[PDB]
Curated annotation (Swiss-Prot), chains A, B:
The active site is at residues 103, 311. This is 2-methyl-aconitate isomerase. Its EC number is 5.3.3.-. GO terms for biological process: propionate catabolic process, 2-methylcitrate cycle. Substrate binds at residues 18, 65-69, 105, 271, 302, 307, 312. InterPro entries: PrpF, PrpF-like. Keywords: Isomerase, Oxidation.
């Protein structure tokens, strides 16, 4: 006996440079309406994981970190919030869904999905204009604001706003990551540190907890320039192994793990990235990024490979770190106080703003801001074999 | 000033080791219900192409040949057929949909889709048992038969049938490719030819038109063992170019194209593949394929890269060629008469049957047979901006 597949109401969306499968909590099977193995098993099967072929041909996944993602949204019980946002990074190779972080790219899609699916107080949705969606990011306990355009009572998806890494234009969605610093911003208590990896090297690093726990290293310390593309790194097993050990040692120094061996099973956080001063390069689309077009270069890894553009959470970490004089990110951008930076990633450029202000002689960051876009790709029902 | 996206009823399915977006003809926007610019533009946009980033983040595509596919199905008005099947291979990088060939992997999905969407006379569907779907493959003008299991009047999707390259088991769907040889099996009139490839060299090749036009060369004559996985070839841009030049010159030699430059925008057909005698190797999943487990090894390229498993149409070409004594495929399997072969591809093994009969010095093949599986991944509506 092999019962028919179940059907679960879902929407497949692009948010920024990421793709995800979005669910209303109430649309999930009863067993999956709370965190736990039942929920994880459903999401794993929807995506096509675990997959020893690493192709996700038997699911909704695209076999990359940017395309192996799930989102569960529900009404909020938090004061001054409209929607609760839970994000699951679905492992391609392991039966594991990681709930330890946010997805900054899908935030624009979160706002749109909430409006389109009855998760926002109707009084907050104008007939035309802007719907300000106040998102409670339930993974990290942070407020994120999405300013979603509205036309004729519906989300305005289409438009002429272009973002590097996104093939086609769409409507601009402004996002505000409120109070991004973990609440410490710098867990080591230092703006810069030296990560000692005995027998491998010594590496200047800034370790910051804002957007997502992130370790920034200088490109030159790795023999890189910061202009590298995926093909320069992602077939280099030695380089990948090196990034992973530095990430592990950074995780230990940040107090995110107690023993170095824990890093193997904790792949999603912290992120590791490398920075450099402005330099001209051809992006992955063949478009020239001039040194004059950027304040710095940043490349980041996700789930053990160089990311094709930039993770939204990592973009928050870049903006926040750039606003603090003396961080490796700030110094790559020429030092001094900074309200915003435009950085060069493999697919082009991204501008992120972060207002740092002194209070009691210490830096505080009110918010980090960026613009993304989002659109529905498919809507209806996903199917999996009966649980 | 920017109209909403349109909704198009569609089903996203896995068929064999491929994923595709399936449409009823009548569900398409009127402009796309005939061949031409409007249809190709729509399918490109659904998939997320052309994409200079080569990631298909802004569409249904998975940025690989196995995952950049569209299918248009309708009830057949042709005598002795149930469903008209039109397959479009959507280019990742170019504004092109290739209509020159079939997709053998998606054939099982075509049968299931036809049953589930009223494209076959209900009187032909048993309440419980197997529904024999007669498919008119409209790209190549051939009959293909799909034997789809039925439970309680609906397609039985789930089951315990396992196929190398498919993550999870599903219901077995037996497929029959009727009279696979082109209306000639060997367009050159020879079982093995010397293919002259200007700027590269000359190669012994079997060029066969069955399932899909295919050029077969010995692994050793290209400097390979036949045990190669994707990482051994797909980052070797010199090797890839060499393959493409040979593929182009083979296309010309087979009379598929009139001029060598036509191969640039005819990428789906012909295919190029290399063969070897049985050898042990670890598959892409880490599973050992023992030499005793197979009759030969075959690796094939699709759209310029080594394929992750095997194309279904190339599997037909392999089975058919193996059945004709003296082809490079037959010789790789040790020669003599063969009614079926199991070959090793990067993902494991696949068995194909194709009995050949000799009369008056000529071999004919009534049918090529293999088993696949299919399942619905998502159903509902895809969205694209208003055309
Ligand atoms: Ca990628
Ligand atoms: Ca293919
Ligand atoms: Ca129709
Ligand atoms: Ca592939």
């Amino acid at each position: 006996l092999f019962p028919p597949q179940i059907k679960v109401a879902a929407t497949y969306m692009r948010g920024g440079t990421s793709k995800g499968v979005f669910f209303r909590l109430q649309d999930l099977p009863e067993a999956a309406q709370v965190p736990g193995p039942a929920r994880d098993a459903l999401l794993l099967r929807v995506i096509g994981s675990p997959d020893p072929y690493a192709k996700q041909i038997d699911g909704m996944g695209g076999a990359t970190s940017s395309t192996s993602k799930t989102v569960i949204l529900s009404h909020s019980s938090k004061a001054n919030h409209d929607v609760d946002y839970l994000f699951g990074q679905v492992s391609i190779d392991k039966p594991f869904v990681d709930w330890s972080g946010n997805c900054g790219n899908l935030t624009a899609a979160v706002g749109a999905f909430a409006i389109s699916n009855g998760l926002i107080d109707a009084a907050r949705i104008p007939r035309n204009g802007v719907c300000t969606v106040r998102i409670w990011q339930a993974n990290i306990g942070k407020t994120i604001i999405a300013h979603v355009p509205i036309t004729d009572g519906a989300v305005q998806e289409t438009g002429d706003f272009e973002l590097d890494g996104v093939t086609f234009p769409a409507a601009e969605v402004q996002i505000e990551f409120m109070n991004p610093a973990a609440d410490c911003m710098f867990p080591t208590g230092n703006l810069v540190d030296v990560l000692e990896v005995p027998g491998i090297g010594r590496f200047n690093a800034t370790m910051i907890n804002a957007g997502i726990p992130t370790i920034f290293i200088n490109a030159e310390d790795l023999g890189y320039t910061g202009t590298e593309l995926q093909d320069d790194i992602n077939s280099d097993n030695a380089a990948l192994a090196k990034f992973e050990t530095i990430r592990a040692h950074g995780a230990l120094r940040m107090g995110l793990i107690k023993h170095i061996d824990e890093a193997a099973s904790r792949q999603h956080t912290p992120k590791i990235a490398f920075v450099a001063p402005p330099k001209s390069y051809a992006s992955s689309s063949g478009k020239t990024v001039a040194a004059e077009d950027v304040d710095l270069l940043v490349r980041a890894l996700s789930m053990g490979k160089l990311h094709h553009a930039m993770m939204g959470t990592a973009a928050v970490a870049i903006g926040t770190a750039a606003a603090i004089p003396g961080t490796l990110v700030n110094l790559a951008a020429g030092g001094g106080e900074k309200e915003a930076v435009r950085f060069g990633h493999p697919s082009g450029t991204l501008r992120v703003g972060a207002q740092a202000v002194q209070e009691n002689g210490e830096w505080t960051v009110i918010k980090a801001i960026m613009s993304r876009s989002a659109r529905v790709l498919m809507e209806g029902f996903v199917r999996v074999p009966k649980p």
